[PDB]
Amino acid sequence: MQKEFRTSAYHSRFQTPFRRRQEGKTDYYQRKRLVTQHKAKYNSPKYRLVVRFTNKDIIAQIVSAHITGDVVFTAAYAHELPRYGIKYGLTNWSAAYAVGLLVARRALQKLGLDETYTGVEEVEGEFELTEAVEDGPRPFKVFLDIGLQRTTTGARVFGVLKGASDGGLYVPHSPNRFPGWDIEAEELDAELLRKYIFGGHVAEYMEELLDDDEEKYKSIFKNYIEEEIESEDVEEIYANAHEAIRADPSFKPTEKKFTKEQYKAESKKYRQQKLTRAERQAKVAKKIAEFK
């Protein structure tokens, strides 16, 4: 009764979106405004802090765009954080701060701007931008790029932002999306933000859950129990981690348990190779024969 829709003309005239748009990974409107440079700043690149969250990891890359594709300047991951003394909550707000700090220190060390622009060393949760030194190189400037993630006050992407800013990178931002901002009296509760930097929210949850529902506390906080880490011991974890990141931010790659050819040979055992022309033609001849 109603015309069948998926016709050959519908498919023929269909215009497919950009490949990374149909995968739902790239916002090209935002990417255009983020990437395009002043034409009178000819080959000078704009740098993006790409901050991405998975269900288990935090990805922070400093990226510049080019015709053949983006080029990574430095990258940091939350799964690197065991090396600095953080083992659990690898998607905390606080792990986000640590990864931002790591990527900032790593980039400034790659640039030679370590001793200049050491950032905020005594962290108190205040809002602060990296200021330029007199008669010196200007701070490394990067722009925050959060992809498809929503701008809500308290979100972890701005935790990576805060870590990177305190690490010495100049990242323009306003404090009104940090945990601690109050929209009525528009100022920042620096105490709440500095609590969020050092895992204070998780520490409070640990204490209250231990004192109220011990069995749920047992299931949720199993790793802290087995390592014997009470709610009193979290802030020193994050402070020691920050000190360790500041002392040695160089990238260390995993010592590969297998070389590339072993990985390749072991994965080629599992890829269905396509048929050939003759094989498909023989299948058609047979399927005709059975139909007779």
């Binding site: 395009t36 034409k39 015709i67």
Partner: protein, 159 residues
């Protein structure tokens, strides 16, 4: 009454290509233009700002000015019995590099390299291009290629 508005007559010239609507690929925004570059002008109908007039659609010119989001381009326009130098401000979506110039710069490099090779060898080479010359003499073998005779064919209808 007649109508001679700014975009009159542009029904097809300013259309996007078939199945080429929508977002501009970012390569358009990553190109770098310098004063003296030679650029082709092509209006993009989806970018209403910084558009060329229909006259400059399909014209090629010299870049003379570089601003935040656009280039200034010099075009020569026949007005009566002489050319007038025109200066048009165009956002980069409406601009593209000209490929003939890249070819010519390549030839400049090749001529220099060949001249240097000859100078190191001790001789002189010719750098001017040449038009296609008439072919020289040749011998054609008939091995497995005996001349085969053709004739005009009779008329036939097929209706």
């Amino acid at each position: 009454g007649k109508s001679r508005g700014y975009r009159s007559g542009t029904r097809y010239a300013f259309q996007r290509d078939f199945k080429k609507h929508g977002a501009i690929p970012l390569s358009t925004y990553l190109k770098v233009y310098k004063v003296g570059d030679i650029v082709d002008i092509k209006a993009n109908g989806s970018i209403q700002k910084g558009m060329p007039h229909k006259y400059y659609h399909g014209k090629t010119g010299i870049v003379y000015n570089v601003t935040k989001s656009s280039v200034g381009v010099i075009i020569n326009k026949v007005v009566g019995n002489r050319y007038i130098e025109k200066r048009v401000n165009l956002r980069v979506e409406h601009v593209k590099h000209s490929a003939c110039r890249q070819e010519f710069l390549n030839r400049v490099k090749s001529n220099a390299a060949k001249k240097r090779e000859a100078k190191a060898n001790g001789e002189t080479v010719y750098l001017k291009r040449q038009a296609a010359k008439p072919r020289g003499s040749r011998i054609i073998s008939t091995e497995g290629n005996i001349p085969q005779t053709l004739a005009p064919v009779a008329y036939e209808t097929f209706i």
